[PDB]
């Protein structure tokens, strides 16, 4: 049975997969081909019933596509839309509907990346318009707007525990460490060699001065913000590294998403432990189960919701 307001079918291009603290799967999907080029938001309190539409807890459609997604708390959903808007949608009191809280058109091009800051009162967005905007979720406004980059903004990642700190990476080849407390907030960091364009960023969930980045060539790199010249790097993929996700474990695992249609799971030394060729198209997200730590869920453009058992 389909909930009220929920669309009859889901758009083929699965963009985001986000497990909530309780274990309920949040889905982001875009219609990238055919007549209508829009998107939708889905909730699966039963993650084993996704992508099947008639077996969801909540569903809604968005005006335009969904380039990026993020859980704002336990009821809020922050969306990066093709429209140029950063949208905030809120779960029903019964968690059966997904209602629009705000839709602000602040960016001049597609919004591709969103990360909510450690508190949950603020968020950062990155668009093809080369800008980075710091938002006030409560006030429904842009607090700050930064034109630090020279090409489109590929990834923005808020610090695990600092509301002033966040990472960014662009097609201008710069990885920028941000601190809103400094008069000049960004700082250019990374390895000595310029190399290949950065495409994905992932803060370490335990070491607050360590993160990982993926490049356009399939290389995953381990970076220390302090020593500001990388030591560890593994050519994990044959194509672009789309995303990097850390497992909830005390000694976390690193999931590697790619355009090569595969998923890899790496250790502390960036060594391969698992690999999944389950997808037949681009892998667009990864989300580790909060309930079963060894379970990892991925979505792709092949409309598959694969549940991996990670050893």
């Amino acid at each position: 049975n389909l909930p009220p307001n929920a669309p009859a079918c889901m758009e083929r291009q699965l963009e985001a997969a986000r497990y909530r603290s309780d274990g309920a799967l949040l889905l982001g999907a875009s219609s990238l081909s055919g007549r209508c080029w829009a998107g939708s938001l889905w909730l699966f309190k039963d993650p084993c019933a996704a992508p099947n539409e008639g077996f969801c807890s909540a569903g809604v459609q968005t005006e335009a596509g969904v380039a990026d997604l993020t859980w704002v708390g336990e009821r809020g959903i922050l969306v990066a839309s093709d429209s140029g808007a950063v949208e905030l949608w809120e779960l029903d009191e019964n968690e059966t509907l997904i209602v629009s809280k705000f839709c602000k058109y602040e960016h001049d091009d597609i919004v591709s990346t969103v990360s909510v800051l450690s508190s949950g009162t603020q968020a950062v967005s990155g668009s093809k318009d080369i800008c980075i905007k710091v938002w006030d979720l409560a006030q429904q406004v842009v607090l700050s707007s930064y034109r630090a980059h020279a090409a489109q903004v590929t990834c923005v990642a808020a610090s695990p525990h600092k509301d002033s700190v966040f990472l960014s990476c662009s097609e201008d080849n710069r990885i920028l460490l941000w601190d809103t407390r400094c008069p000049k907030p960004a700082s250019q960091i990374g390895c000595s060699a310029p190399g290949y364009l950065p495409t994905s960023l992932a803060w370490h969930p335990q070491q607050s001065e360590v993160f990982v980045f993926g490049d356009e060539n399939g290389t995953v790199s381990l970076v220390d913000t302090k020593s500001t010249s990388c030591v560890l790097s593994s050519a994990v993929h044959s194509q672009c590294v789309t995303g990097l996700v850390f497992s909830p474990h005390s000694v976390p695992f690193l999931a590697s998403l790619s355009e090569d249609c595969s998923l890899a799971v790496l250790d502390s030394s960036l060594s391969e432990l698992f690999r999944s060729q389950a997808h037949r198209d681009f892998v667009r997200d990864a989300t580790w189960s909060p309930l079963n730590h060894s379970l990892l869920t991925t979505v792709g453009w092949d409309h598959q919701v694969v549940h991996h058992v990670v050893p």
Partner: protein, 625 residues
Amino acid sequence: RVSSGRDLNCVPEIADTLGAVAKQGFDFLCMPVFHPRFKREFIQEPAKNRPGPQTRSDLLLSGRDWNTLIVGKLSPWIRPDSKVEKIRRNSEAAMLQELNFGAYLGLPAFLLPLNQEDNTNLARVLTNHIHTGHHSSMFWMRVPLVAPEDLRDDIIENAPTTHTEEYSGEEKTWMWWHNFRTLCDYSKRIAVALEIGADLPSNHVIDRWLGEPIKAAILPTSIFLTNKKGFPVLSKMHQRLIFRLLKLEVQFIITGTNHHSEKEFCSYLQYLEYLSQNRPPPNAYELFAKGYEDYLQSPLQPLMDNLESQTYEVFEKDPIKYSQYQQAIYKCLLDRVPEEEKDTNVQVLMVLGAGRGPLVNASLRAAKQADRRIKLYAVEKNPNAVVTLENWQFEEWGSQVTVVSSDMREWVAPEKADIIVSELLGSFADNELSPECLDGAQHFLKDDGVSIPGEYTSFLAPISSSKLYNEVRACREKDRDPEAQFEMPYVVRLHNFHQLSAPQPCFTFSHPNRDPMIDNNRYCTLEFPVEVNTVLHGFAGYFETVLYQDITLSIRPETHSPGMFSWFPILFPIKQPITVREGQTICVRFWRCSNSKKVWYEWAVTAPVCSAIHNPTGRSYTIGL
């Protein structure tokens, strides 16, 4: 009357989006033809075998809508010049796919960015698409005045923005365009879509775009200031550039989201319509020249060829020209015959090249003003024009005017003249052979006789115009030298060009020619200081003439006779464009050559670099004697 477009990178439903931009008043729409985020694979499995459709169907709009209202846009992930081989190969395949689809749709224009220095492979793939078939479709190269790297906020603590002046660096995006269109061999299908930023660069950086084929101007919503009532407006400097671009008749494109959210998107449009309506109106010359902008014409050879009726008609509808001729005669008559002799002395006036008689009438009007007695001889070689003259002489002029049907160099005059009047001048003064004509006639001018005009001087100026270079290049005719079109001058209303240096005098002739051995041949060296970085495409030619004393005519822009629209400037092109840096001198050499049968010009640039001698022996261009 501004033709405008809406740039969108998000179109959920094509029909609703089209109707939306239509209601807002936009003439066309720039939109993706494939979803901007829909990255496609062509080599690697499994992503290669992705099920279709790859985009939205052509059936969604009528053929007419596609041909007229849609401007395609290349997908932002297509990076043909990427450092990653896999990306380079894939973007080549994706670029071809997108361009082929837009050609399939019959799109009038398609946009591609120049957002970096190296676009060699983007040029190789586009050029290849142009040479795959034969079509009219335009390619608008989306290029900004200021590169993003040069307009980024000074917020990177360890990587600061340069506060030093870099004259050449500030002109870096022009070089991107220059190199891209050089590689594509100046295809007439490749034009500029010039993106204007919030902060304008130095005027030199802007001027660097003069003479370039700008077909569209892209204005982001962000550059618009907010006025006291809350309406989007522009700075006085942004207005200056808008007015400049309005003259070039570009299509204005609005990009970005609505930042003046209280008002609608048509407020950005309304401002442009307001600016368009509040410019100086088309003055007598600008209204006349309309239509002839950068339109190349062969200069007339009225000696070798007999001019048509409607040509003399056009010559005639120039009041200022003949007003001045009248005044020059009126002045000469008073100087030649005093008030005491006002009834004893009858001045013998000879109009040499009388056409349909505007100078015969102007001489009569000059006499009925100076209150003096005149005898007229209206000499004309064109027997067709003579029919007009003899029907005029019978019905009006009477015995006062003697119509002579002869070549002025052959005519055996019964008596001598006090004044010989003529209008044998071309856009380059002596190009219609005024010197040779008047030398053959000066035997029948009294020993103290006057010539109106008495003196003429031509002027040259170096110009930059990629539009006019390409316009000439396209003048290739079968059954002749494939490079002949560059070895000939053109009468053109120069519009999209840049004058690289102040006009300097070239050739001077004086009548009567009191010289014992008359030589109309000339060799002249001109040194033109250039204070800009540029590309030399040719030389604009002009003239000035002394009819009598202070009574003159001029087409030299600094001294152009006001309201006089008879002569348009002349153009001497060069076969190969020449790069000129700031501070360098353009040295040109010009010769006026002749034999017994023909006259011509030869020319060559000798600095900063040499050109070949243009028109050796008059091989491509001669004027018949």
